Design a protein around this ligand. Structure first.
Ligand SMILES: *[C@@H](CC(=O)Nc1cc2c(Nc3ccc(F)c(Cl)c3)ncnc2cc1O[C@H]1CCOC1)CN(C)C
Length: 299
């Protein structure tokens, strides 16, 4: 029981775009800056590009072809979509350039400008996206300040569907079977059993926000991944951010529950911040508080 997909998937000649600067690389491959110059049309277009390492590993090719589908599919003010695809040997993902870039960086810079109404209107948008994804059976498995981008300070969108896995009908979870992971982010369920759910994704929406309110701050800084589980089991978590009123910090603790269905759903995280949004100064305390290219968003 689902309607027609009706999404577009754009295939591009490698010539239509040119990669300008390097943003990130690991084992996967690389993500370039670059700008796309549509065939025929003389109109330059800022984009970002993720190329992959290899060209012929069956499941690897399977994995990416899924990552595309998902990103093509999504349509949400706060979810980034796939512009198109290059189907060259080492497959490349074309995707819309967010000017200001990842939301982690952005708080590490502008913190002395950054204020209450924004940090709450941002959390609302992240919840909206995650809940929108939840609406469409999709699970992320890699939330983190990192994977949120800034179109404009009054608006953020969710990127990086590289660890996403879509779920079936009766299915309510997914078991991984080995792979590189962000340990100091995913849920305890996910670490000892390799289980993931939407309720695993909330947890990180916790860590994510904890990262926001602290203004970047490295989670479990120093402390390695090799007893994170043990640590959580003993019952230590990340400490109240200074600026956080207890009302807010609480929610973070609701998301670090060892019980999965005790953790707030994105449906209800949305409201807990939309509420706080109307009176942002009574939930966060930030001293000094009231102080020929084309964008592509035209088809
Ligand atoms: C965050 C800095 C950073 O990487 N910023 C950044 C990312 C970005 C993306 N990301 C992306 C990721 C996966 C993927 F599959 C695709 Cl297709 C894209 N996409 C579009 N535009 C982006 C802009 C962006 O920023 C801009 C600021 C300077 O120039 C780019 C720090 N982490 C690396 C830890």
């Amino acid at each position: 029981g689902e309607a027609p997909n009706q999404a577009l998937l754009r295939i591009l000649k490698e010539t239509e775009f040119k990669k300008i600067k390097v943003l990130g690389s690991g084992a996967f491959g690389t993500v370039y800056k670059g700008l796309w110059i549509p065939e025929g049309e003389k109109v330059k277009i800022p984009v970002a590009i993720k190329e992959l390492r290899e060209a012929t590993s069956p499941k690897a090719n399977k994995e990416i072809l899924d990552e595309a589908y998902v990103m093509a599919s999504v349509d949400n003010p706060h979810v980034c979509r796939l512009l198109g695809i290059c189907l060259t040997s080492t497959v490349q993902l074309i995707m819309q350039l967010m000017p200001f870039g990842c939301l982690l960086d952005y708080v590490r810079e502008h913190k002395d400008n950054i204020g209450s109404q924004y940090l709450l209107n941002w959390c609302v948008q992240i919840a909206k996206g995650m809940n929108y994804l939840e609406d469409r059976r999709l699970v992320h498995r890699d939330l983190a300040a990192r994977n949120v981008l800034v179109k404009t300070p009054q608006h953020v969108k969710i990127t990086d569907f590289g660890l996403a896995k879509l779920l079936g009908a009766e299915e309510k979870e997914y078991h991984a079977e080995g792979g590189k992971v962000p340990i100091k982010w995913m849920a305890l369920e996910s670490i000892l059993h390799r289980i993931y759910t939407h309720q695993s994704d909330v947890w990180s929406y916790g860590v994510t926000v904890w990262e926001l309110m602290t203004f970047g701050s490295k989670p479990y800084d120093g402390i390695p991944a090799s007893e994170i589980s043990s640590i959580l089991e003993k019952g230590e978590r990340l400490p109240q951010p200074p600026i956080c009123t207890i009302d807010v910090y609480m929610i973070m603790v609701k998301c670090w529950m060892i019980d999965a269905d005790s953790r707030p759903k994105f449906r209800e995280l949305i409201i807990e911040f939309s509420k706080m949004a109307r009176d942002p100064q009574r939930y966060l305390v930030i001293q000094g508080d009231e102080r020929d290219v084309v964008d592509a968003d035209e088809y």
